[PDB]
Symmetry: D2
Subunit: 458 residues, 4 copies
C-alpha cells in the first residue's frame, strides 16, 4: 500500500509496435510513458526536481513553487508538490485551452494567465510575470525546467536504467522526441556509458526547429521544438537529429492510436515516425526503443478531431471512413435548407441597387441574370462583383445612378452542385468564385472564403 499517488511515478512498461513498423526491419519497442500517475512523462522529472530542491535547501517546507509552464509539466509538479503541501502558482499563455487549465487547478494549483505570442522579452509575456512573481513572494522556487540539470539527471537515473534492464542491453538505437533537451540527453548519457558505443542516440524534432538546424516557426505539436538552446541539453549526446513534419506527426499519431491501441499525442507520433525512418538503415537483429512521452486524451479536440486537422493542411483521410461524401451542393446550405435565395441583379437596375443587394445579403459576388424567375438556364448576362463596383465608383469610372449593364465583369465559371469538395478545392485554385449549376439552372455561388469556412468547421 503506497503512501501517496506520487510514489507510482516510474517503472512504466515497454510495449512492442506490431502493425506500424514495416516488414523487413528489426523490432521497434515503444516505452509507453503515459501510464504514470500524472498522465505525462514529465512527472518523472517533477519529483526529482522537488526532491533536489528540498534536500539542497532551496524549498523550505511552506514555500510556494512558481513555474511558467504550459500544462504538461504543471500536472506532475502540482501532484508531487501537493503531496506534502506546497502551494503551487503557475503562469500560462493564452494558447492553452480551458480544459488544461481546469486540470491544473483541480490538482490544487493557482494558474494565472498572460497573453500569448506577446514578445517574450518584454514585461508582457508570461516569462517576465513569472520572474516578477518569483522576486516578490517569499519562499518561491522557480524550478526553471529548461536550465535545471535535474531533468536529465532523473531521466539518467530512472529512465536509462529501465530501458536497459528491460531489454538486457540488446538495444541498438533510442529515438526520443527532443522538446526541452531532457529525455534525449539523460538516456543518451546512460545508454552510452554502460554500453560502450553500441547504442546510437537518435533524436526526433519538428521540421524547422533550432535542434534540426533551422529557424523559428509557429508550432502545433505541443511540447517539442524550440527557438533557442536550453542550457540543459548537451547537443553532443545525440547522433542524428532527424527532422519531421507536422502533417506526418499527426498522421502517425492517428495511425498509432488506430493500429496499436495507444492514444498518444503529437510528440509521440513524431518520435514514432523518426524511429520508423531510423528502422530503414539498420536491418534485422536491431531493437529501437521509441519513447512515447504523453497520453492522447487532451488532444481529442486537436488531432483526433476532424475539423482542427482540416483547419490546416492536414487530414489526409477522414477519421474512420470515406474520403469526403460531401458535395458543393451541401456547402451552400448553412441551414440544411437555406438555398432558395439566388441573389441576382438584372442588367437594368442602377449600380447603387446592386451594391445594396450585395450589402444586404452579405455576399460579395452575384450573376446579373435577366429573366427574374430564378429557374432560368445558363442564359446569364454576366456577373457583378463588389470590390469592382466599389472600385469603379470611387475612382470615377462609374457613377452611382448608372446602369449595371455597363460595369459588369464577364460571367464567372461554373461547376455542378452535386460534386465533392475536392474538385472545388482544386477548381478555385484558378479563379476567385464559381457558380454551382444544378440541373442547368444556377442555384448559388461558391467562393473561397466560404469553402474554407465549411472545411474549417465540418
Amino acid at each position: 500500500i503506497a503512501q501517496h499517488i506520487s510514489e507510482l511515478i516510474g517503472g512504466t512498461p515497454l510495449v512492442r509496435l506490431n502493425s506500424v513498423v514495416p516488414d523487413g526491419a528489426g523490432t521497434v519497442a515503444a516505452k509507453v510513458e503515459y501510464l504514470n500517475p500524472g498522465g505525462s512523462s514529465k512527472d518523472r522529472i517533477a519529483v526529482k526536481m522537488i526532491e533536489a530542491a528540498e534536500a539542497s535547501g532551496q524549498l523550505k517546507p511552506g514555500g510556494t513553487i512558481v513555474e511558467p509552464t504550459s500544462g504538461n509539466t504543471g500536472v506532475g509538479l502540482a501532484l508531487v508538490a501537493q503531496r506534502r503541501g506546497y502551494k503551487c502558482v503557475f503562469v500560462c499563455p493564452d494558447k492553452v485551452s480551458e480544459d488544461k487549465r481546469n486540470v491544473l487547478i483541480a490538482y490544487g494549483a493557482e494558474v494565472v494567465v498572460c497573453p500569448t505570442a506577446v514578445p517574450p522579452h518584454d514585461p508582457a509575456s508570461y516569462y517576465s510575470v513569472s520572474d516578477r512573481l518569483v522576486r516578490d513572494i517569499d519562499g518561491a522556487w522557480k524550478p526553471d525546467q529548461y536550465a535545471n540539470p535535474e531533468g536529465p539527471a532523473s531521466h539518467y537515473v530512472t529512465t536509462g536504467p529501465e530501458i536497459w534492464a528491460d531489454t538486457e542491453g540488446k538495444v541498438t538505437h533510442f529515438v526520443a522526441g527532443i522538446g526541452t533537451g531532457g529525455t534525449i540527453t539523460g538516456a543518451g548519457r546512460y545508454l552510452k556509458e554502460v554500453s560502450g558505443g553500441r547504442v546510437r542516440i537518435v533524436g526526433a524534432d519538428p521540421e524547422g526547429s533550432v535542434y534540426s538546424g533551422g529557424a523559428g516557426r509557429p508550432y502545433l505539436v505541443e511540447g517539442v521544438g524550440e527557438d533557442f538552446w536550453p542550457a540543459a541539453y548537451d547537443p553532443s549526446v545525440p547522433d542524428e537529429i532527424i527532422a519531421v513534419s507536422d502533417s506526418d506527426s499527426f498522421d502517425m499519431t492517428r495511425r498509432l492510436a488506430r493500429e496499436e491501441a495507444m492514444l498518444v499525442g503529437g510528440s509521440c507520433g513524431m518520435a514514432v515516425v523518426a524511429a520508423l525512418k531510423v528502422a530503414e538503415e539498420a536491418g534485422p537483429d536491431a531493437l529501437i526503443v521509441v519513447l512515447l512521452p504523453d497520453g492522447g486524451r487532451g488532444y481529442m479536440s486537436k488531432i483526433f478531431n476532424d475539423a482542427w486537422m482540416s483547419s490546416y493542411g492536414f487530414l489526409r483521410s477522414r477519421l474512420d471512413g470515406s474520403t469526403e461524401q460531401s458535395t458543393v451542393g451541401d456547402v451552400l446550405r448553412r441551414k440544411s435548407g437555406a438555398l432558395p435565395a439566388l441573389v441576382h441583379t438584372h442588367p437594368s437596375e442602377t449600380v447603387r441597387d446592386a451594391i445594396g443587394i450585395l450589402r444586404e445579403y452579405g455576399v460579395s459576388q452575384m450573376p446579373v441574370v435577366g429573366a427574374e424567375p430564378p429557374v432560368m438556364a445558363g442564359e446569364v448576362a454576366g456577373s457583378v462583383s463588389e470590390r469592382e463596383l466599389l472600385s469603379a465608383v470611387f475612382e470615377g469610372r462609374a457613377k452611382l445612378a448608372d446602369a449595371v449593364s455597363a460595369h459588369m465583369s464577364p460571367p464567372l465559371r461554373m461547376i455542378g452542385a452535386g460534386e465533392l469538395v475536392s474538385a472545388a478545392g482544386k477548381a478555385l485554385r484558378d479563379w476567385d468564385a464559381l457558380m454551382v449549376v444544378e440541373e442547368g439552372k444556377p442555384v448559388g455561388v461558391i467562393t473561397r472564403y466560404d469553402l474554407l469556412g465549411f472545411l474549417s468547421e465540418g
Copy 2:
C-alpha cells in the same frame, strides 16, 4: 355645392416664381397643378378619357377599367371612375413604393403587382398581364394613356385655354416636362393655333431619353423620359427640346420647395430648370409659363430624404444645416460605441488563425501588430488582407499552417479620427482601406464598403 369631388379637376392657379429665377429675365410663372382633387396634373386626362369612352359606347355601364398605370394616373382614374362605380384593376411593377399601392387601394381599386426590370414584352412584365386581363375579363377597357388621343385632346381643351386666359394672351414661352407627350403636345397645339407663331413650345426631358436624342437609361425622376416613342406625341409641336440631368432636377425641386413654398416632385424641378435655362436666351419683356405637374408629398422619402439622395452622388447639401459635420470617428461606430475591438493579428500567429479572426469579426482587413493590447503606436509591423490569404492559400504560394509574417502586405495608410467624411471619401480614391489614428494609436480600419454603407444610411 359640387355634385362630386371629381368635378373640381381644373382651373388650377398660376403662381409666379420669385426667388428662383435669376434677375434680368422675364417673369417665370409656374402653373402649380398639385391643387387638383387627385393631387397631380394627370387627373385632367382621366376625366376626359372616361367621358370619351362613356360617350362613344366603349365602356358599357358595369365595365372594369384595367391599365398598367405608373401610380399617378392611377389615382385620377380611380377617383373619376369610382364617381360612377367602375371597378379599377391596376397592374404595377414592384418598383413602386408601398404607400403608392396603399393610396391606389384606399380609393377602391385592386392593384396586382408584377416584377420589374424584366424584359418589357415577356409574360412576367405588367404589359402582357394587362393585355391578358383586358382580353379575359368582360367589360374591360385598357385606356392606354400612352397612345390615346384623349390625353393631348384634354390637355388642349382644358390646359391651353387656361394658360392663354389667365395671362391675357401675353405668354411668350411654354416649357413643360414631356413624359408621355401629353401636356406639351396639346398645349403647344393650342398656344400656336391662337397665338400665331410667337409661343415657342419648349420641352424639358431627363438627360438620356429618346426625345432628347440619346439612348436608354435607368430613370429616377418618376414620370418623365421614355425608351420608345409614344403614339400620342407629335414631335413637330415642340421647338427647342432641352435636356436636364437628374442631380440638377432634384436640386431644383428641393430649392423650389425651399425658396418658393411648393412641395413639387422631380419632374417639376426638371421643368423649372428647363424654364430657367430658357429664361436666359430671352431677355425681359417675356413671360415663361412652366407647368408643375405633381405634388411632392409622396416623394417625401425619396428626394426630400437625406439618405436616398446620398445613396447616389446627389445631395449637394443637407436640408437643415452644415454640410456634413460627420467625421470618420463616427463612421466606425455602427452602435455609437462599437469600436472596442481593434482586430489585430500578431506577426507570429498562423495564417489560418488570421483568416479565422477575419471571418469571425465580419471584417476584411486588419493590421498585423505586435504587443497585442491595442494601445500601440504607429509601430505596426504590417497589414494582412483577406483576399490575399485566400489567394496565397489556394494558389499554393502559402500554407494554412505558415506564419502570418511571410504573407503580409505592407501597412496601409492612416488618417485622423476627427475628419469629415468628405475627406475620407476622397482619400479612399487611391487605396482600398485606411486606418483611423486617434492621438497616433490606431483604433480601426475604414473601408470603401463601409463608407458607402454609412453614407447610404445616415
Copy 3:
C-alpha cells in the same frame, strides 16, 4: 398670376356626400379644405395670425417665429412666413414621424424635438423649451394658436362667409371637429349672427375629451381632442357637442375615402360620423355642412395601413377584401418555412434540461411528449411551462437535478393548424397558449404573445 403660393389660401370648394349619408335624410355637404396650398385647414389661421402680428407691430420684419406645434399648423406657418422671409423655429414632441418633420423642414423651418409624454408643466416637455427659446432669442413671436383669438377671427371672416355664400343661407346645421375652438367658434358665431337662430352649431369630439365632458386619455386621431380649456374656444357657441369613438372615426375615414373619393384623415372621419349621427334628428329638407379639415396623405401609414389599424382593436375589415384568409398554421412560420422544430422534453430529462431547452429555443411552454420522433399522435404525456419550473425551483418545491415527469402541468388545449386567427383569438380568450394539431400530430404551440405580435405586423 398670383404673387405667391400663399394667396391661394381660401375659397375651398364645397362637395356633397353621395353614398355615405343614409337614405331618408337631408343633404350633407362636406366643405373640403385639404385643397389649400398648405395641405390642411390651419393655414387660414396661420395667414391671419401672421397678418395680425405684422400689422399690429409685434413681428418686426426680420423676426423668428416660434411655435410648439405638432406638424399640421407648422406647414401653414412655414409657408406663409417664408413667403416674406421670417426665420421659423418649431418645437415638436417625439410622437411625430420622420415624414412630418421632413415636411416641416422642406419649407425652410428649423424643427427641434423634445421627448413625448413627458410632464408638460416641467422644463422637459416641448412647452417649457418653447417658452425658453421665445424668451432668449430676440424678435421671436410665439403665436400661441391655443389662446389667440385670431384663429376664430379668421374662421369667422373667411370660413363663415364662404359656407353661407356658397349655400345661400339655406344651411340648418354645421358640424365640425373641435380641438382648439378656432373653427367651431368662428363659423358658429358667423352662422348664428347673420342667420338669426336657424343654424344649430353641432360639434364633434373624440369620445372621452374635455369638451364632451370627460377626463384625459391618450389620443390617436391627431388634431382633435384636448385635456383642458383653450382660451380661444367659447363653450357657449356650440349647441350639441357629440362624442365619437376612435374605431368609428377611423372606419368612417376609410369608408369615406373608399366611397366618396376623399382622402381625409381622422378628424374628418370623426366630423362626418358626428354629422351622420346629426342627420337623423332632422328629416328631409335640411342641409348639414361638415368641415373636412385635413388631407389624408400623411395617414397612409396610420389608418389606411392594415397593421397599425390592427395593432389596436381597430380594423373591422381588411382594406380591400376577405376578412383574414390566414390560418394559425401560418402564424407559426416567421420564415415562411420555419416550423420543423417541435420543441419537446421527454418525461425523463432532468428539470434543468427542460429549462435549458426553453431558454435556448426562446419559447415559454412545451409539450413533454415521449416518442422523440416529432410525428406522434395526441399521446403527449403533458406540458411544461417556464414560469412554473422557475417558480418550482426557487421556492424549493423542486430541485434542478429532478425529473420533469413530477413537475409538469396537465396537457394544454389544442386547435387545428388550418384555421383562421379569429377562432385562435376566441380560444386564447380562455387560456394562455394552445397546441396546433396538424393532421393529429402536434406541430407547434401558439401563444397569446405570438398571436398578438403577428397580428400587430401582418
Copy 4:
C-alpha cells in the same frame, strides 16, 4: 517487452487515502484503477470476456463485436479486440458527449448513435438496434456486459486476489460502487471465501436506485445505478448497501482530487463517500479497501467544470477561490456593458405601446416611470408585466388602445447593485423579479430566468 498493450491490464497499485478520511479510524486504502491501459477498471472484464468467447468458439476469427456500450467498457473492448482485429460496432445514446465517441472511433471502432430518453424497448432505443445488428450481421457477438458471468468471474480471478495479496489478508472491509453488479459480486465472493466471514462486502449506490431500495431516477454519476436487476448481480454477496446522493458524490470527487492527488470521476467519489461513512462504525485496527474504477479526465467538463456543477444545486464552492465575488450589478450585463437600456413605459402611453416595447426589447417586465430620461429616483409609479397585459387584453378586462396607467401592477421590490448573487437568489425566492437600484436610481430589472441563466453560464 510486452507483446501488446492489452496485456498490461491488471496489477494496478493500491494507494492509501490520507487527507480525506477523518482521524480516529482505520486506514482507507483506495485501489486506483485509472492506471490501466484503457483508462478505467472496466477493461478487466473486457479481456476476460474476449478470452472466454474466443476459447469456447462463440466469436469465430473474423467476427464483429456489437454491444450497446456506455462508452467506458467500449474503450476496453475496442483496445482488446483490435489487438487481434475484430471489428467493433458500438451503439450509443445521444446522451454521450462528442469526445467520448471520438475516443471510441480513434481506436478503430464504428459508433452508431440512437436517441435517448425514449422508451428502452422501443424500436429507436439502442437495445433494439443492437439486437437487430446482432441478428443481421454475420459473426456478431453481443457480449451483454449486464448479464454475462464473465464480468464477475474476471473481477473474482484478477481483482479479488490482488486486494488480498497486496495487503497480506489484513482487509476488514471492501466498499466498491455497485451499478451493473460485477465487482461486488466478484471481488466479494473471493474476499469472503478466503477470509472466513470477516470481510464484510459493503456497497455504494446513488440515492434512488433499485439496489438502494428506491424507484427510478435520472442519473448523473455515469456508470452506477440502475432501474432494473442485472442478471449478473448476486444480491446476497453485499452485506450493507449504503446509498449516497449525487451532490455528495461530486463534492467528494473534487475534494479527493484536491487533497489526495487523484483525478477520479463520479462513482469514485461516491465509493469514497460510502467508505468514509463505513470508516466511522468501525474504529481503528481496521483497513477499508475502496475501489476507484475510473479516471477523471473525460469528466473535466462535467464535475470539474464550474457551470455544469452550478446548472444544478451543486457547486458548494469554486475550485480556485472566493465563494462568488459576483454581484447582481454583473448579472445585468450580458455584454459587459449592456445596461444603457433601462426599459420603461410612461403612465400615459398606450397599452399596445407597452406591449410592443416589451416585445422589442426582449424583456418580460418593466417599470412605468414618468420623466422618461432614466436618471429618476425611487419615484416610479408602478410596474407593468407582460403576462398581465396579454391577459388583461384577451379576457376583455382592458382594451388594447387604453392608457397603461389603468392596468399596471404596483411597483416591484428593489435591491442594490453590488450585492452577491446568493442574496439575489434568496430574494427572488419570494418574488418573480426585482429592480436594481444604483445610488437609489433604478438601472434594470433582474428576474428568476435571467439569474438562473447567468448561473448556468458563468
